Structure 1
């Protein structure tokens, strides 16, 4: 099946806990995979303005580890619940992808999660201004704009609204698309 095929591909790139004990400032992100209309999609947030860290940007759900988190996957799930109301029974964490090093003292750990078909996003307006889906296949042939910095523009065919996706978020989206969609019969 489509979902079993995706999880089996993703498992080959799981690094597990290999890098999780190193002494960094620690953040996790959840890359949430949603099946709709026979295709895979990724779920993105638009961050609120009132936030000190990173206002108005397109990002995956996530944030800073705290002392309650049992492990780095727990951080990602805690933060996804607070931002969009995703509950634990509604997500299966499939793997941990290559972490991202930033600013010399920070390590960001990405987890891929499969999302239950009955989940419906409840944006928390104190953290998130918007929540939207992008088909995974988009990231193999994106609409690119140069700010030189590469920026993707995605227009939702439902309402004509355009979103800009860039930086680590765009890099991780392309990676997940390559892992899941490369070399597939039609």
Structure 2
């Protein structure tokens, strides 16, 4: 099936816990995959305008590890619950993708999660101003804008609202799209 196929593909790129013990400042992100109308989508947030770090920007749910977290996946799930109400019974963590190094002292670990078909986002307004879905296939033929620097623009056909997706968030989306959709019969 579509979902079994996605997981089998994703597992071949799982790096494991290899890098997770290194002595960095540590953050995790969840890349939430949602099936809708016969196709896979990614779920994104727009961060609240009142946050210190990157207010108003499009990003995946995530944040800083704390001492309660058993491992890096736990950080990602704790943060996804706090930001959009996603509960643990509603997500299957499938793998851990290549982590991102930044500012010489920080390591960000992305986890791909399959989301339950009855989940509905309850955005917490102190952290998240908006929640939206993008079809995974958009990332193979995006609408690119040059700020010189590559920015994606996505317009939701439901309401005509345009979103800008960039940086690490945009890089990870393209990666997940390549992994799951490359080389497929129609």
Residue 54 of structure 1 deviates from its aligned partner by 1.4
**1:33 match:** 33
| CA deviation profile, 1:95-145 (whole Å, cap 9, x unmatched) | 000000000000000000000000000000000000000000000000000
**2:100 match:** 100
Supply the distance in 1 between the matched residues of 2:145 and 2:56 (Cα, whole angstroms).
19
Residue 53 of structure 1 deviates from its aligned partner by 1.3
Give the structure-2-normalised TM-score.
Answer: 1.00
Supply the distance in 1 between the matched residues of 2:92 and 2:85 (Cα, whole angstroms).
15
Residue 52 of structure 1 deviates from its aligned partner by 1.2
Aligned-pair Cα RMSD in Å = 0.3
Specify every segment of 5 or more residues in structure 2 that has no aligned partner in the other structure, as ranges.
Answer: none
Counterpart secondary structure, 2:180: helix
| CA deviation profile, 1:72-96 (whole Å, cap 9, x unmatched) | 0000000000000000000000000
Specify every segment of 5 or more residues in structure 1 that has no aligned partner in the other structure, as ranges.
Answer: none
Supply the distance in 2 between the matched residues of 1:50 and 1:182 (Cα, whole angstroms).
39
Supply the distance in 1 between the matched residues of 2:116 and 2:34 (Cα, whole angstroms).
7
Residue 172 of structure 1 deviates from its aligned partner by 0.1
Supply the distance in 2 between the matched residues of 1:151 and 1:131 (Cα, whole angstroms).
19
**1:164 match:** 164
Residue 34 of structure 1 deviates from its aligned partner by 0.1
| CA deviation profile, 1:2-24 (whole Å, cap 9, x unmatched) | 00000000000000100000000
Counterpart secondary structure, 2:6: helix
Supply the distance in 1 between the matched residues of 2:117 and 2:129 (Cα, whole angstroms).
23
Residue 49 of structure 1 deviates from its aligned partner by 1.4
Supply the distance in 1 between the matched residues of 2:149 and 2:22 (Cα, whole angstroms).
31
Residue 50 of structure 1 deviates from its aligned partner by 1.3
In the TM superposition, structure 1's runs of 4+ consecutive aligned residues that sit over 3 Å from their partners are: none
| CA deviation profile, 1:16-48 (whole Å, cap 9, x unmatched) | 100000000000000000000000000000000
Residue 181 of structure 1 deviates from its aligned partner by 0.1
Supply the distance in 2 between the matched residues of 1:103 and 1:111 (Cα, whole angstroms).
21
